[PDB]
Amino acid sequence: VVAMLCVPWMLLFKPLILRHQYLRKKFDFGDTMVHQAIHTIEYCLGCISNTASYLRLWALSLAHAQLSEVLWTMVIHIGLHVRSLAGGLGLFFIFAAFATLTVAILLIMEGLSAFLHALRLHWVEFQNKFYTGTGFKFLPFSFEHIR
């Protein structure tokens, strides 16, 4: 109930008081209502959606854990055997391929994916709470042509 009670403030009271203060000091009231209503929906609905976004932490941590467990089990584990020499030599060739797969799949590709997904969370869910608006590129005179 309290969560609902806070909504009027965030939903419409900002343009309402701006109209109050504006007319007393004297502003498209209708347009301001549109802006604030959209903002309120984005914040309230986004919090719900954003929470889902951070399920990427679970989803990717699990997905990685699944790759590691399966890649180990179906590659290096099978390379082991009760026969001494065959087991040792097999581990050599199997491990070499195993390490290759760990790099190709996890160190590169998945590391890159997790990079992008964590960067996504920063840009969309974190920054959108406070880091707003745009600015211009700062381009001072500089002695760039050194080479």
């Binding site: 989803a59 997905a63 399966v70 799949i105 590709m109 992008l116 997904h117 996504r120």
Partner: protein, 150 residues
């Protein structure tokens, strides 16, 4: 005590998870390669960057491999059917999800490659849109994983 055919549904799950994911990743790869070949002639310096849609598609293919193997290693003869339908759902869930993902990858990448070459400021946006499709594909993987313990 095991309803016959109970193992049939399970085996199909492992297969579908791999086949549908390969279809999606292949579609995305085919679309990207077309745009890459056309773009790279004029701006070969972008050839390395243009691969990203394809790597992302490749992730979709892995998503499918994970489920297909997880199910395959979970198959037995005396399957109680209940478990089998969970495996079939997991296969189908990730399969179609990866398939749709791969299509989004391919279609967006093709346009993205051309757009970036004409306007490099679009590079980040290209990655972003593909990134959302990859996140959608991940959901397909996770739900397939969740069912394995239900």
């Amino acid at each position: 005590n095991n309803p016959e055919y109970s193992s049939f549904f399970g085996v199909m799950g492992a297969s579908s998870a791999m086949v549908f994911s390969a279809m999606g990743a292949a579609y995305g790869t085919a679309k990207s390669g077309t745009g890459i070949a056309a773009m790279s002639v004029m701006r070969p310096e972008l050839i390395m960057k243009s691969i990203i849609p394809v790597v992302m598609a490749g992730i979709i293919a892995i998503y499918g491999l994970v489920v297909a193997v997880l199910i395959a290693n979970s198959l037995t003869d005396g399957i109680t059917l209940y478990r089998s339908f969970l495996q079939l759902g997991a296969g189908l869930s990730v399969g179609l999800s990866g398939l749709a993902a791969g299509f989004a990858i391919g279609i967006v990448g093709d346009a993205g490659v051309r757009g970036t070459a004409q306007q490099p400021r679009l590079f980040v946006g290209m990655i972003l849109i593909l990134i959302f499709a990859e996140v959608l594909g991940l959901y397909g993987l996770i739900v397939a994983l969740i069912l394995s313990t239900k």
